[PDB]
Structure formats: C-alpha cells, structure tokens
C-alpha cells in the first residue's frame, strides 16, 4: 500500500512514469502540473494541488528554487529546536535538457541566429517575412505557457543571457539599464509591461498541449522540452539555433563547467543545481530538471523507497566498459542529457547512503522529525 506522491514539471514526466522505460518505481505517483505547481505543493505540502490526499512526498521541477522560497521554507518547516520540524528539504538534478522551438510553417530548413530567437520571442519580429532567406511569409504566432513553468524559466535564461539590446528593443519587454531586456520568468507573461497580442497562452497546461498547440494554426511557434517532439533533425519543423540541432548540447560546456558542491555548499539546496543561460558551444538553450525530496520522512518506508530510486538514479555502472547510470539508457531514450558521473557520485553519496548525516532518513538528522504520515 505504501504510496510515494509526487508531481509537477511536465518537461521529464514520461521518462518519470507511464512509458515502457520509465523510471519511478510503480509506487511514486506523479501529477503533471508545471514546475510552479509543482513547487508549490511540496513547499507547502498539499497534495489537492496534485490532484490526491496526504503528505506531498516530491516533485519534479525544472524552476530552480528560489532563495524567498528556501528562507519561507526554513522559517516554516525547518525551525531550529522545533519537535514538530519536517527537517531540511533536498533539490537534486535529476538530467540535463534542451529547450526546442518547434514551429509550424511549411518550407525549408530554418536555422535561427540569437538575433533572431530574441526578436521573436520578444515580439520584435512579428511575421514570417521579417526571417531573411526563410521563403515564409505571413504572421508569427507565438505560443507560451500560461501557468509557472520550468520550460519557460530555461529558455528566458538563455534569452536574457544571450539578447542584446539592439536585437529586443522596440519591444514591450519590462527595462533593464533603459532598454527592454528579457528576465528570468517562469511565468513567461511576466517578460512584459504588455503582452503583445499575437503571443497566445496555450490551451491546456504542460508542454505537450502547447506543442500540439503550434501545430493547430499555420505559423505558430513555441517552446517545449524534446521528449514530445517525433523528430529533433527536422529542421523544417524544429528551429536549429546558432546552427544547431537541440539533440547538440555540448557537455562540456554546460554539465562539465560546474562540479558537485561540498561542505556549506552542499547543505544550500541552491548550489545543487547550476545554471549555464550562454553556453560556450553547441546548442545553447539547456539546463538541469530537478527533484525537490525531503530529507527525512516519518514514514520510514517512503524514505526507504526514496533512497532506493537515488541508489539507481544516481547509481554507477560499467557496460561496455563505459561508465554510465543505471537510468542512462531511459535518460537517452527520451531525447535528456545523462548527468556527469561526478554529480551522480556526489548525490549518490550525500543524499542516498543512509549512514552520511545529509541522506534522506539518516538516523542522527532524521530522528523523530519529518514529513508526515
């Protein structure tokens, strides 16, 4: 009977359940909601926001979390000397992804400059034969997430690390230095002072529904993580930007630039998950998906059940005579990125080895305190 309840990101949902190779263990439910739902439930532990009862157990997330929510978190749920403390909460990156642009509009091969990503996305441009060379003509459409998404917050990074302001002025973008700017948003609307009218909210929450969205009415475009997408290559159908395909993330400038913290900086769920807005090469819209835990659970058997899924998630093995996660293979399969061996030792040993004082249900931390039954 014991059940594990989590939700959120729809970005990793099907690598997490209801595909072949899914992850989670038959007994972890995930609702599929949007990053900041998400959030919200195990923050606050309500479960009606995922649509069950009892103690939200998890989430998924591609929204780091912010420091107003880890400090309203500590002060509420984390309180030094409180018998009724839930104890600390673990933000952990599960795997790396892109953000694709998907349109729908018929014609050639379409390889987007930053210039260009940032005007449509901004509103600067605004119809099909503002795209040089393109051989399209006629309105662009943009499709966004309405509720708090960890899509939106990825791909306003990258656009607020890598815009110009010559390549987004004119435009209804909120002023930094003067000038419209993009912003980190995982609520895309609130880019603007105005949202400008063709931009449309998509019909129904989670990235799928907008991707079917831009495919509805001729010379849409949107943003959606790659698991949805049937084809990454097909570029009549898929923007490459800076001449890249989303299936051409650089490793090593993304996942490699930034090792496992220790010490203090293991213990701010913060620094567990980096952030890469203007990567060095390769594709440059990418970013981490992350699990929000508890670190200690009053049920014993959900924090067991906890630390078995980090022990394989998290996990080493050599095939092939190649160093891998146990997940690589699902990881892939669904189009993510596996994360470097280093993070996964890290997480594996801090938060999945029940004998380190940081591991989800560690005796010493965790007695007589957690979430509840």
């Given at each position: 009977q014991t059940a594990v309840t989590g939700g959120g990101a729809s970005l990793p949902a099907d690598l997490y359940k209801?595909?072949?190779?899914?992850?989670?263990?038959?007994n972890f439910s995930y609702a599929v909601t949007g990053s900041g739902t998400g959030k919200k439930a195990f923050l606050e532990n309500n479960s009606a926001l995922f649509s069950t009862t009892g103690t939200v157990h998890f989430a998924g997330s591609d929204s780091v979390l912010s420091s107003t929510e880890l400090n309203t978190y500590n002060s509420t749920?984390?309180?030094?000397?409180?018998?009724?403390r839930y104890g600390a909460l673990v933000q952990i990156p599960s795997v790396a992804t892109s953000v694709t642009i998907p349109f729908n509009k018929a014609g050639s091969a379409v390889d987007l400059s930053v210039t260009q990503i940032c005007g449509i996305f901004s509103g600067k441009?605004?119809?099909?034969?503002?795209?040089?060379?393109?051989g399209r003509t006629g309105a662009i459409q943009v499709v966004y997430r309405g509720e708090s998404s960890g899509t939106s917050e990825l791909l306003t990074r990258f656009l607020t690390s890598a815009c110009q302001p010559a390549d987004v002025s004119g435009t209804n973008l909120k002023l930094a230095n003067g000038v419209p700017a993009f912003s980190v948003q995982s609520?895309?609307?609130?880019?603007?002072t105005t949202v400008p009218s063709n931009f449309v909210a998509a019909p129904a929450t989670g990235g799928s529904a907008l991707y079917n969205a831009v495919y509805a009415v001729d010379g849409r475009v949107g943003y959606v993580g790659p698991?949805?997408?049937?084809?990454?290559?097909?570029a009549t159908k898929v923007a490459k930007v800076k001449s890249f395909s989303?299936?051409?993330?650089s490793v090593q400038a993304t996942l490699e630039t930034a090792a496992p913290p220790t010490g203090a900086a293991a213990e701010n769920?913060?620094?567990w998950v980096p952030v890469f807005?203007?990567?060095?090469?390769?594709?440059?819209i990418a970013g981490y998906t992350n699990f929000v835990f508890g670190?200690?659970?009053?049920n014993a058997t959900v924090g067991a059940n906890v630390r078995g899924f980090l022990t394989r998630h998290y996990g080493s093995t050599v095939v092939n005579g190649v160093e891998q996660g146990p997940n690589d293979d699902a990881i892939r399969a669904h189009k993510f990125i596996p994360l470097t061996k280093a993070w996964r030792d890290a997480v594996r040993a801090r938060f999945?080895?029940?004998?380190?004082?940081?591991?989800?249900?560690n005796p010493s931390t965790c007695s007589g305190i957690g979430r509840p039954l």
């Open positions: 209801g595909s072949a190779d899914s992850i989670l263990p038959a749920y984390n309180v030094s000397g409180d018998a009724n441009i605004n119809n099909w034969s503002q795209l040089a060379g393109l609520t895309f609307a609130n880019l603007f698991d949805v997408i049937p084809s990454l290559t097909d989303p299936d051409e993330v769920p913060a620094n807005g203007n990567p060095s090469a390769g594709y440059p670190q200690c659970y009053k999945a080895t029940a004998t380190n004082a940081g591991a989800v249900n």
